[PDB]
């Protein structure tokens, strides 16, 4: 857990999203970004997350023993159902991208991530075709 | 015997003692004493190149500082992967065979000696155009808490309890090391910490690297050595609590 929350970290702070909440978020005092500062790094080209076109990016998802699979086995199911939408190139936003290894890792963290990831869905949504799956 | 011990495989547990296995197979010197020869049928691996592929990283520094470049090149071309590559990322283990011999007092009697004088043999062959010499700094100053982290885990102090694998020094010889590490450098500064400061990261890396050794075995002796060394590099870390660790201090 701590590995992959260092490598999410990191990964978070190296992109532009990062810098612009660092710009805003410095003038607080806050022991976080004491402890936040030697992950940090300063580089000419900001860190670029990749976006892979998915020919069809509602067959992850268009499953309905992936959303009620319910055998007495939630940490799986959120688990699953939380990467199933990362692996999707629905996501806009680029620090959720980085959060798969650290949702890999721990059940609470797929239970908080899942309303913003279903958010960011719907908010790049045309159409009405993600809405109404 | 794996079972009672506590550990989940069989290759974990002969895994665990597999330098110091190579190494006395080495020490042999006979014709039929060879690492092919090596039984891997007591490892889980079918085939010797099963074998290979699963521990090069440990059968490599032992032919490296034993001089056998022929078999090192063989074992690459068998397992079909970049020979510079299989040497590149053993180049720490590789490291805490030559670096440790020239640090502390050298010529002092003849047994330990020659191992300075081979250490000093190999490490001006591999300077050459053919092997890493082009980039042998490069790849010295890129990852330098993997050489921290493998100079430290070879700590052994003389009570009534097993030695770690064959690599084991003392303190002062470690410490001595990273005083040759840090004058050897191009700026010649005086601590190692100084450099190790430049990536305030690094400091993170190595605190995990002894951490997850740590975490993964429950021998109570090899968690006490492993310890020691945490304890070593805490207390190093706190003798340049002067100027701060580069903003990674909190």
């Not at chain 1, 909440?21 to 670029?48: C, G, H, N, V």
């Not at chain 2, 490599?60 to 074992?75: C, G, T």
């Amino acid at each position: 857990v701590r590995s992959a929350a260092v490598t999410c970290l990191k990964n978070i702070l190296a992109t532009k999203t990062g810098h612009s909440f660092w710009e805003i978020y410095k003038m607080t005092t806050d022991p976080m970004l004491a402890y936040l500062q030697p992950f940090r790094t300063s580089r000419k080209k900001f860190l670029e997350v990749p976006r892979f076109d998915k020919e069809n990016p509602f067959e992850g998802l268009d499953d309905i023993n992936l959303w009620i699979p319910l055998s007495e086995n939630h940490d799986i199911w959120i688990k699953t159902l939380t990467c199933a939408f990362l692996d999707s190139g629905g996501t806009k936003c680029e620090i959720l991208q980085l959060l798969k290894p650290m949702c890999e890792v721990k059940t609470d963290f797929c239970q908080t991530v899942l309303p913003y990831l279903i958010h960011d869905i719907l908010l790049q949504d045309t159409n009405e075709s993600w809405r109404n799956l | 015997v794996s079972e009672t011990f506590g550990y989940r495989r069989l290759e974990d547990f002969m895994a665990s003692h597999l330098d110091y296995l190579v190494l006395e197979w080495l020490n042999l010197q006979d014709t039929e004493y060879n690492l092919s020869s090596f039984p891997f049928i007591l490892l889980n691996y079918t085939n010797i190149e099963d074998f290979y592929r699963s521990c090069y990283k440990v059968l490599i520094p032992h032919l490296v500082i034993r001089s056998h470049f022929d078999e090192v090149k063989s074992i690459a071309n068998q397992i079909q992967e970049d020979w510079k590559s299989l040497l590149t990322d053993c180049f720490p283990k590789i490291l805490v065979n030559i670096l440790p011999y020239f640090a502390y007092e050298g010529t002092r009697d003849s047994g330990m000696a020659q191992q300075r004088e081979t250490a000093t043999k190999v490490y001006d062959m591999l300077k050459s155009e053919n092997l890493l010499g082009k980039q042998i700094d490069h790849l010295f100053i890129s990852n330098l808490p993997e050489i921290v982290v493998e100079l430290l885990m070879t700590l052994h102090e003389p009570d009534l309890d097993p030695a770690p694998n064959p690599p084991h020094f003392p303190s002062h010889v470690i410490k001595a090391t990273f005083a040759y590490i840090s004058n050897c450098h191009k700026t010649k500064l005086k601590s190692i910490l100084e450099i190790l400061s430049k990536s305030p990261d690094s400091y993170q890396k190595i605190l995990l690297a002894i951490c997850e050794q740590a975490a993964e075995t429950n021998n109570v002796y090899k968690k006490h050595r492993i310890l020691k060394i945490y304890h070593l590099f805490v207390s190093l870390l706190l003798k340049d609590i002067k100027s701060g660790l580069g903003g990674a201090w909190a």
